[PDB]
């Protein structure tokens, strides 16, 4: 599962999730396409054309004029609590809000897991400020990259 | 420390995908077209976690208006009937029978782009949006370590699946991290999308090539399933809080619990995790089937616990 954010010069902001739900999906590649196909048998039970019932891209607009896109990959509803309460509620800087340890039960950086557990997730974010300055943040728990001009 | 810029910004799980979005911006493209180029770049570079063979989800916030959501996830195939999975106690995880729902992302790209032509007054050539994705397929990617690890740690189980070894293995093992890894097949696919158009995946030559492949494989999906498929446009689940509005793409059954947590909203250090107590009282608020905007401060203040 990948999360991606983009904000352009006019302030259009995009938050995106793309996935095959499990590693390599079904294993099955479609001949002469290179496409490994997703495997969503879990979105259904046993007592056609039926759609599944699901992933959560996120975005926020703030009273002071900030727009913000974020997203967590792996882990998950507690990661969003953390980033919301840290960044929005508590004024913690964006990059620090994503880095500070999290909980499902807790990261050793405070039952108590390693100082950086892949089970607390990978979160990214962009905040656009009314002065037009653009802020991207990456999760130290992975190898993400923020690229801006 | 935080990277700050003045014009545009892309955050991605792989630096090559971030730069593919970034180039489109610098070339005058919109954030959406930059996102589409990335969706294709991150498909070549992290193929084990995502790609053209899965689903996609957009939340788009225009400069002034309401947010726009894109549920680009596919439905089960027309051959995927309750009978076809006999006395099996679940749907298999691997094999042609697990590949039973349609792949949506590409429909998300086609829909977002039509949105980005309505919002922008312009649009770049599709052949430009896929250019980086194509070249990284023909000419290769730096094998990520997680692609190597995922492939090794699933090698014994997926070793025999149709197309697996020919496409993901090197000398029959997992490719070495830091090595150049090609996808000559995926490039022909991406080159077809560029000549024929993104929607040809469901309604053009590539859709028909995908149909035969499904037949030969025994997959419960038909050409009708592809042609009949559009990205959906549901409404975002919206949370009003003291500092503003926050959106999540989720149906009311799955996303009520998460958004209610935040609606918490007098918090300005260990109390911070405990005040988790809100999550306890939140699942309670959910408790028919998958059964709405109650998430009001007039409704969550009883919190007061």
UniProtKB/Swiss-Prot annotation, chain B:
Segment of the intact protein contained: 3 to 324 of 528
Source organism of the structure: Klebsiella pneumoniae subsp. pneumoniae (strain ATCC 700721 / MGH 78578)
Protein known as: Oxamate amidohydrolase large chain
Gene that produces this protein: hpxW
């Amino acid at each position: 599962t990948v999360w991606m954010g983009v904000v352009d010069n006019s302030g259009l902001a995009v938050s995106f999730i793309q996935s095959i739900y499990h590693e390599f999906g079904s294993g099955v590649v479609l001949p002469d396409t290179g496409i490994v196909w997703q495997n969503r048998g879990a979105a259904f039970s046993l007592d056609p054309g039926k759609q599944p019932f699901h992933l959560n891209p996120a975005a926020a607009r703030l009273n002071d004029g900030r727009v913000m896109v974020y997203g967590s990959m792996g882990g998950q509803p507690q990661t969003q609590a953390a980033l919301f309460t840290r960044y929005i509620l508590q004024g913690v800087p964006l990059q620090e809000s994503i880095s500070r340890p999290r909980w499902l039960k807790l990261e050793g950086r405070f039952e108590v897991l390693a100082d950086f557990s892949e089970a607390m997730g990978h979160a990214g974010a962009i905040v656009r400020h009314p002065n037009g300055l653009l802020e991207g943040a990456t999760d130290p728990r992975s190898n993400g990259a923020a690229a801006g001009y | 420390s935080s990277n700050v810029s003045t014009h545009g910004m892309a955050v991605a799980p792989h630096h090559l995908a971030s730069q593919s979005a970034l180039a489109i911006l610098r070339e005058g493209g919109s954030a959406i077209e930059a996102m589409v180029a990335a969706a294709a770049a991150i498909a070549v570079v992290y193929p084990h976690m995502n790609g053209l063979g899965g689903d996609g989800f957009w939340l788009i916030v225009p400069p002034e208006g309401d947010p726009i959501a894109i549920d680009a996830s596919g439905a089960a195939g027309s051959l995927a009937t309750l009978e076809a999975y006999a006395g099996q106690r679940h749907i298999p995880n691997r094999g042609p029978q697990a590949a039973l729902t349609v792949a949506g992302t590409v429909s998300g790209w086609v829909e977002a782009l039509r949105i980005s032509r309505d919002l922008t007054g312009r649009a770049l050539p599709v052949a430009r949006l896929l250019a980086d994705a194509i070249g990284y397929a023909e000419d290769g990617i730096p094998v990520t370590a997680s692609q190597a690890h995922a492939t090794a740690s699933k090698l014994e189980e997926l070793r025999h699946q149709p197309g697996f070894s020919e496409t993901w293995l090197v000398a029959g093992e997992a490719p070495r991290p830091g090595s150049r890894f090609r996808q000559p097949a995926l490039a022909g696919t991406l080159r077809m999308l560029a000549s024929d158009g993104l929607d040809s995946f469901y309604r053009g030559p590539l859709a028909e090539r995908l149909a035969q492949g499904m037949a030969a494989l025994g997959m419960p999906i038909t050409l009708g399933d592809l042609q009949a498929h559009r990205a959906r446009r549901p409404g975002p689940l919206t949370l009003q809080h003291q500092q503003g509005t926050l959106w999540n793409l989720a149906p009311p059954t799955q996303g009520l619990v998460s958004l209610a947590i935040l609606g918490t909203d007098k918090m300005a250090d260990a109390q911070t995790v405990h005040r988790v107590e809100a999550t306890k009282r939140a699942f309670a608020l959910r408790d028919t089937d998958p059964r709405q905007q109650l998430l009001t401060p007039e409704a969550l203040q009883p919190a007061d616990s």
